[PDB]
Amino acid sequence: EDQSREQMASDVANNKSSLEDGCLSCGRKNPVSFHPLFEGGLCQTCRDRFLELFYMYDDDGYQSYCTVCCEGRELLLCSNTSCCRCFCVECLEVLVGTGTAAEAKLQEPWSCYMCLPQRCHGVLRRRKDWNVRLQAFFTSDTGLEYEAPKLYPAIPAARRRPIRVLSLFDGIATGYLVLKELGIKVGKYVASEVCEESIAVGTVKHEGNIKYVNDVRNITKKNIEEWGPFDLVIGGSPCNDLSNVNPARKGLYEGTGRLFFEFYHLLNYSRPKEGDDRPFFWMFENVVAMKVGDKRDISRFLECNPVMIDAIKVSAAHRARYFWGNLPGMNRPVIASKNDKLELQDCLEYNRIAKLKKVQTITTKSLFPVVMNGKEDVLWCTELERIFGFPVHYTDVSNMGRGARQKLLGRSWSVPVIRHLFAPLKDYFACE
Template structure:
C-alpha cells in the first residue's frame, strides 16, 4: 500500500483511502462525547476509552494489539482508570509513537487534505489611516449577529451591515441587541445582482451555510448537492457577484465557515469552487469549549491563525472563569455545545459539567453565552425558552475565533476614536 501522507498524530503514514477516512472521522463524535472511531485508524469495532474527563479519545483493539503488543487492548480494557497516549505520551510503546508536534501537524493535515493546489489570493496593501473608510458588510446565514458584535467590539466604523437570516429567534436577538442597526433581508436565495448593486459595494462578505446535510454525524445527510447543502452555492454565487475586477484596487475580503466532519468529496468540491484550502480552527484554543471548524477565505494572516502548540499549553482559558459559581465545576473544559440537550454530558458516565445543590446540573444560558464569547443575557429576548436559546447558540460562531480572524482588517478600514 503506497503512503500518501504522514499520519499527523503518530509516527507512520496513511494511504489515500485511510487519509480520506481520517479527515472525515477524526472530529466525529458519538452522543457520549467520545470519538466515534479509533484515534489511530479512524475505524475499529471494539475500542477502549480514555478515562481523562477532559479527553474524548478512543483506541481500537487492532491498533493496540498490532502496534504495541498482543493483549494490550484486553489489559487496558480491564484497567480501572486509564489515561490515553495523547494525555500521557510516556505510555507510548512499540510502533505507536506520538509525534511531539502533533497539534501543528493536525492543522496542516486538514488545511491540505483536499490534495488540491491553488494560486495564492490577491494581497491588498494596507490603507493609509487618513484614507480608511467605514465598513460595508454582507453577512449570509447571519445567525445571532456574531459578525456585527465582533466588528463593533474591535472598534470598526460600520456604514452598513446587511444580514440574510430566516430564523425568527436569531433575527430577534440581532434586532434587539443591536438596536435595529442590522438590516435584515431574509432568504439568501432571493438576493439578486440588482440588490447587490443597490446595497454595495461591499468590503466584507461572511457566512457559514447550514451543516445538517454536510455533517457525517447525520446518517440522513444529503450532501453538498441536495437539501440544505446546496445553500453553499448561494454563498459562492454571491461571492462571485461581489468580487471586484482585476483592475479595481479596492480591497475586498470574504470568509466562509463550515464543519470539519464532512465527506472528503464535499470538502474537495467546496475547495474547488472557492479556489483555496481551508484552515482548521478549534475554539478550544481561545475558549473553554471545543468547536472545530473549517474556514475558507482571504483574510490577512488567517492561514497562520496562531501557534497551535503554544496556545494549547499556555493560551486556553479557565472554564471556571465562565461559571456563575466556579466552585461547582466538575471539568476543566466542555465539549462542543450544539442544539441537542445531551451535548452537555461529559465522559464515560455522562456527567453534567457542574454541581448545583449537590446534584449534577447543566450549564445556565448565561454560562453558555460567556463560553461562546457573548455578553451575559445576549440571547435573553422575546421570552425565549432555555432550549430556544441553546439552539441559536449551538448554531453560532465562537466570538474569540472570529475576533482573531477579523482583527487584521484594522489595517484597511476606519475605526472609532478611542475614548
C-alpha cells in the same frame, strides 16, 4: 499481496525494516502519508477515510471510532479525566504485544498510552512533536497548490472610509457584534436572517441598525446595485446537511446544502468590475467533519485553500471549522488575549465547582460538568453564552427558555475566533 500486520511487526521488531513503508493499520505497502499520532505510514484509502471521522464525537463525550485506524467494533475507553480517547481492540495486541487485550479490560481504572509517559510498547512509539505535527496534516495536503493571495496596497490614515457590510445567514448578528468590538465604523449592514426568533435579537440589541431583508433566495441582481458598493461579504451556511450524525447525509448538491451556491452567486455580483481598484474581500465557514469529495469542491469553486483555527487555543470548548477567504493574514500563529476564558471554571455562576477543564462540543441536542452543594447539575443558558464570548443575557428576548436559547447558541460562530480573523481589517477602513 494483502499482507497482514503481524509480518511487518515481526520484521521491524528484529531491526529488518522501517515503520514508514507500511500502512500503520491498513497493512498495505506503498504509503501516501504519515500518521500524526504514531510513527508510520497511512494508505490512500485509510487517509481518505480517517480525514473525515477523526473530529466526530458521540453524545456521551467520546470519540465515535478508533483513534488508531478508522473503525469501531469493540472499544475500550480511557477513564482519565479531561481525556476521552478510545482505542481499538484489534489494534492493541497486534502491535504492542500478545495478551494485552484481556489484561487491559481488567485493570481499573484504565489509562490510554497517551496519558501515561511515553514508552515504546511494541512498535507504538508516540511522537514527541505530535502536538505541532497534527496541524500540518489538515492545513495543506491536497494535490493542487493555488497561488498566494494578492496583498492590497497600503492606504493613508486620512484616506479611509466606513465599511459597507453584507451578511448572509446572519443568525444572531455575530459579525456586527464583533465589528464594533474591534473599532471599525460600520456605515451599512444588510443581514438576511429569516428566523423571526433571531430577527428580534438583532433589532432589539442593535437598535434597528440592520436593514433587514428576507431569505437569501429572492435578492435579485438589481438589488445588489440599488444597495451600493459592498466592501465585505460575510457568510456561513447551515451545516445540518452533510454530516455523519444524520443517516440521510445528503450531499452539497442536494437538500439544504445548495445555500453555499447562493453565496458564490452573490459574491460574483458584489465583486468589483474589471478595471476597478476598491478593496474587496470575502469569507466562509462550514463544519470540518464533511465529506472529502465536497471538501475540495468548496476549495475549487472559491479558488482558495481553507485554514483551520482551533477554538481550544482561544476558548473553553472544542469546535474546529474551515475558514476560506482572502483576508490579509488568515494564516498566522493563534494567540490568546488577556480577557479570555481558557478554563470552564471562569464560565460558571456562584457556588458552583467545575469538574472538568474543557467541555466537549455543543450541538442542538443537550452528565457531571458541575456540582453545587454536593449535587450534580447541568449548564445554564447564562453559562452557555460566556463560553462563546457572547455578552451575557444576549438571547433573553421574545420569551425564550432552554428550548430555544440553546439551539441558537449551538450553530453560531465564536466571538474570539472571528475577533482573531478580522484583526487586520483595521487598516483599510475607518477606525475609532
